[PDB]
Amino acid sequence: MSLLSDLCNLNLSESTEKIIAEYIWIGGSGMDLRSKARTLNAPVSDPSKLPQWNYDGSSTGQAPGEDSEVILYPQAIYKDPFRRGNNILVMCDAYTPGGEPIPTNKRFDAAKIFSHPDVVAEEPWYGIEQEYTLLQKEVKWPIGGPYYCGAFGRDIVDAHYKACLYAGINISGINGEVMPGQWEFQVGPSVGISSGDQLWMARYILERITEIAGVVVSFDPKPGAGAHTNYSTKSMRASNMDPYIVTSMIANTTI
Amino acid sequence: MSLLSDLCNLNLSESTEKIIAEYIWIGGSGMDLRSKARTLNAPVSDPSKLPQWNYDGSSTGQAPGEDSEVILYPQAIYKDPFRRGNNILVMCDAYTPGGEPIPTNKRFDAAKIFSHPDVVAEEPWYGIEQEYTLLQKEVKWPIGGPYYCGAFGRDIVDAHYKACLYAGINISGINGEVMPGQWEFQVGPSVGISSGDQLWMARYILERITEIAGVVVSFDPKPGAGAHTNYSTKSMRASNMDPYIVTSMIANTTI
Amino acid sequence: MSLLSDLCNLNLSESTEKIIAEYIWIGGSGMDLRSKARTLNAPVSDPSKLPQWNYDGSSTGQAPGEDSEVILYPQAIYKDPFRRGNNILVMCDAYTPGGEPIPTNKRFDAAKIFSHPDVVAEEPWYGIEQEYTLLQKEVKWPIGGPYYCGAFGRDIVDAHYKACLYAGINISGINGEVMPGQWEFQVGPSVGISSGDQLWMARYILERITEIAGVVVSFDPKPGAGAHTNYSTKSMRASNMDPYIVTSMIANTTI
Amino acid sequence: MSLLSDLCNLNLSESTEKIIAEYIWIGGSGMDLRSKARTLNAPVSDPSKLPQWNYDGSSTGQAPGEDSEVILYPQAIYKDPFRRGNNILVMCDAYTPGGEPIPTNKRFDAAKIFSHPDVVAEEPWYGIEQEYTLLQKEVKWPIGGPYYCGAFGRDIVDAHYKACLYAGINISGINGEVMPGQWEFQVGPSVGISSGDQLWMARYILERITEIAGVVVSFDPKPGAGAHTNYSTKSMRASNMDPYIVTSMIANTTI
Amino acid sequence: MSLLSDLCNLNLSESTEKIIAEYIWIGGSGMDLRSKARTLNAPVSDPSKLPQWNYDGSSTGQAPGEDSEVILYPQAIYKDPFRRGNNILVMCDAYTPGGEPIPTNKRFDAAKIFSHPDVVAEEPWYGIEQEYTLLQKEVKWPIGGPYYCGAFGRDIVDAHYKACLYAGINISGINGEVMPGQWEFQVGPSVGISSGDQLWMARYILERITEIAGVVVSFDPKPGAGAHTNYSTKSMRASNMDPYIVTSMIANTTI
């Protein structure tokens, strides 16, 4: 009657060489996030050598009826916090076939903004601040002053923090809040496009951890959960809003 | 009081040398599968050295009442997910006595098709796609549009994926879809009769996963579901149907 | 809580040199087995060096009330698949005071039969098949035709099989059957009195695994189940009956 | 909760050098025991170096109101069941300050009896038989003919045996009886005052194991549970009564 | 639910060098205790290189509504029993901005008292005597004369002891009491301000252990529970009262 926990943790270096990999892309609605997996071969740490892939976009909800096929590309390579070992999560972005951004991409524009000379000569360290809430599934409300930096499912938050440490993303620090079940973590001085990458990946990791643990987070402005973006520069040195938009617009407007 | 999982997991290289082996043969209905186990002496990787063994055919149903004796042969030798250690599994095929195929064999015809000089020189690969739904025991209804890679019940599929990786199966990747609880995976470039072997072994492994967990899988097309074929060859390079037939009929017709 | 298995699964080489040893003898009805444990000093594989012991025969129910003293001899040197380590299980033979066999012994007669020059001349290897059923506490009925090699508490059976492999009993393979809950396993190569030894040890091990996992069994044919004998001789090379009677009558009559 | 067991099982030498030690003494009723803990600095096996300590005797009930102070001396150096590692237990005895034994001590008289030249030259060994019952917490009835060396909470007995084998109590075999829940165990060639020391230690370990598991023992003459003295000197070679009395009266009267 | 224990416990040296660190400060009410965390780069045992910090005083209840900033400093070097690894805890203290004491600071007074030339030459050791109670999470009453160490969740106390041993606290021994669920532990020789710091951090450790266990403690004078200090100086060498006050008032009055 065990929840298969004897499995799901097998060592792979003793049986085979193939390593699983999952492809995560932004969904059609702008906040939905969906993924499916494929095997791979001998591990490498260079995203350029990973093969491309596609999927059915109209089924997700970001591609037309006839042009469901929308290609994705590999650019970010990290570790896996739910199937340990050498398994890898890769943050792929949605594209209408032919190289042009999909209508709901908002990734190529950020790439060109942060690759523009006035920005790439600088170091747009965007320590964006993200905060959320952990309610439930059965009641969709938080468990149960002192709550700020306080005791409602702290194990979930500790698991998320340690999984983020393990994965390799740049996270800095967790913090509680007065409103029940509310926390926030800092990602520190990372590149704006990279900062959007880690924000999306960390939201996915949180969603998976909660669904494992028996709860669901609600990334909404009011469950208050929002976003604030700090800016660091070479000269200096909403809970569902797109991180690339806020990070890129600061780089575009300020520079 | 019910903790016996300390058993079922004992190391073998410290007490004895015997290694279990379970014989897997296709049942009478063509989709039902039966199996029983027997010891061995020493580890080996050559299927030709394994001894033969039989069973009572009329009890299973695919043999006559008086001719219940159904000789089986060893062809497949791969590890076991649910007993670990150094155990093996074999995908034996049903045969009438004297080397003649049983009425529900569908193994010798595909073997001779893929051993035909034209086909064997062709060396074709078949990434057969298989679709199914994991329903339940207590309700026998799917676990759970937006469901396409969107959630609950993923752990059974993760366990099955990792068990297939642990075994010798060549699997590719799970694709959650719109139908609740319904998932899917591709096999990949496997050589015909081999592709049928891995499809049957993977179906058995998933059946044991589900009966361990507490769910029941109905592979039938409409409990929709179907089967497709992939044809890659050196010249150019129903969800419950026999993999040998589809991979060989395209081998026979095209070649 | 209820976590006691940390103590149950301790190691002794880090603390002491004393090793437990459990003494098993045939009960009064001819099918019940009573036993307790006695400590020792150093491990050994020679049954002739073990100490002797005696119990209260009248309390058990196979000796006179006043002459309850029933000496027991050591026969078996095999490991314990419930406490592991260097723990051992030892056979015992009920005897009347003075070296004469107890009325319900049926062990010395088989010993002298298989020690006869004729029987030892034609080496009596005995493969014995034994059949049982899995009942339950609340119903005392099988868990839950097609059931032949199909699962009703397969974990109990896998545990028993692996424990038997660990504990030195020469078992050859389990075989699920048509009757719900009903299974059966073959013994294989075993020399007569030895065959009775492994049959009795395997029955005791199954009983203890059923009590550990919390489940009840009935080895009787109809709580139909039965047993057969095989005679592998050098010359040409009831589910609850005493193995010694069965394995020796064919040895005596044929040889 | 699934946690609290990793904490209880933390290794000691990884962080600090301090080792806990608990002080167990005979309570007011003569059968009850009381224990609280102190730290230490370095491991040692010589009882002559452990520091003295006292307590409040009026609260316990074996000291006068004004002279609640009751010094306790270090007696035994043996390990701990539930805090394994380098934790040790000491069997301290009650004493009115100034060297005068408490009326409920009954330990100094046995010391002087076994320290008398005739007895100490006799070297008397006492394999005392102790029998108890494992019923339950609340109902206080047995947990869960054939019962004599039988299936009523056997795990408790196995745990108690394996804990008693922690480099210490010279237990020499466990035993069951017809009375449900009833059990008993025997000690080896214990030297006089030791026999009482190990009997009290084993009773305390059994008490804590039962309270952890979920049962309560009831050491009463009629749960019938009693005791028997055994005498064996160099010349010749009640379930709740004080062991020191019985092991010394046979020492004093015979020698 | 069976998962998350593989989580919350991942190894860090395998993936990233970053180590989490949590900042605990005294709350506004005088007994509330709240904390947030942020990562670092490399381990160190020198409490002079860690970064600075601040938080929301008005939300917590310490600083005015407008000037809510409450600056904090690092001074403690310890470890975490709830996350293990190289994780550390620091006992920061509340200030008004600019280095001036906050109204509920009670740090500079004790620091100057113990660092006063006469006292620091004396360097008095304070074995504070702290006692508390473990009632319940839901009903806040114990789960259950003879109760004086003669149990109500002893596992919690054992866990707290071993956690305090791991965390580097100079603790010396535990004690029960007749009061239901009432315990206490001694810290023994500790240098002045370190006594108060260690009392506060041990209370925090116990608070998190009890909230993990599903049980709430009450640090109130009568659940009774108090605090008492010792004066073990080289010259002779309630449950919520501030340890610094009691340890420094005796330092100031006597010296």
Numbering used by the authors:
A (entry chain E), B (entry chain B), C (entry chain A), D (entry chain C), E (entry chain D): 1 to 144, 155 to 160, 166 to 238, 245 to 258, 335 to 352
Sentences from the paper on this structure:
In order to elucidate the mechanism of how the pentameric CsGSIb (thereafter named as CsGSIbPen) demonstrates distinct enzymatic properties than CsGSIbDec, we next determined the structure of CsGSIbPen. Lowering the sample concentration, which favored pentamer dissociation, allowed us to obtain sufficient number of CsGSIbPen particles, which, in turn, enabled us to solve the cryo-EM structure of the inactive single-ringed GSII for the first time. Unexpected, CsGSIbPen exhibited high conformational heterogeneity and 3D particles classification generated three similar structures with the r.m.s.d. ranging from 0.6 to 0.8 Å, differing in a few peripheral regions. The most striking difference between CsGSIbPen and CsGSIbDec is that several regions are missing in the electron density map of all three classifications of CsGSIbPen particles, with only 229–255 out of 356 residues electron densities in presence. As a result, CsGSIbPen demonstrated a decagram-shaped density map with a few regions missing at the rim, in sharp contrast to a pentagon-shaped map yielded by the CsGSIbDec particles. For the 229–255 residues that show clear density in CsGSIbPen particles, the conformation of each subunit in three CsGSIbPen EM structures, as well as the arrangement pattern, closely resembles that of the CsGSIbDec, as evidenced by r.m.s.d. in the range of 0.7–1.0 Å. The density-missing regions include the segments around residues of 110–117, 140–166, and 260–334, among which, the fragment around residues 260–334 is a major component making up an integral catalytic site, while the segment of residues 140–166 comprising of the two gear teeth is responsible for ring-ring interaction (–4d).
One such an example is glutamine synthetases (GSs) (EC 6.3.1.2), one of the most ancient functioning enzymes in existence and a central enzyme in nitrogen metabolism of all living organisms, catalyzing the formation of glutamine by condensation of glutamate with ammonia using ATP as an energy source. Decades of studies have established a striking notion that all three classes of GS enzymes, despite of dramatic differences in amino acid sequences and protein sizes, share quaternary geometry in dihedral symmetry assembled with two oligomeric rings. Considering that the active sites of GS are located at the clefts formed between two neighboring protomers within the same ring and distal to the ring-ring interface, each isolated GS subcomplex ring holds multiple integral catalytic sites. Cryo-EM structure determination of GS in both the catalytically active and inactive assembly states allows us to reveal an unanticipated self-assembly-induced disorder-order transition paradigm, in which the remote interactions between two subcomplex entities significantly rigidify the otherwise structurally fluctuating active sites, thereby regulating activity.
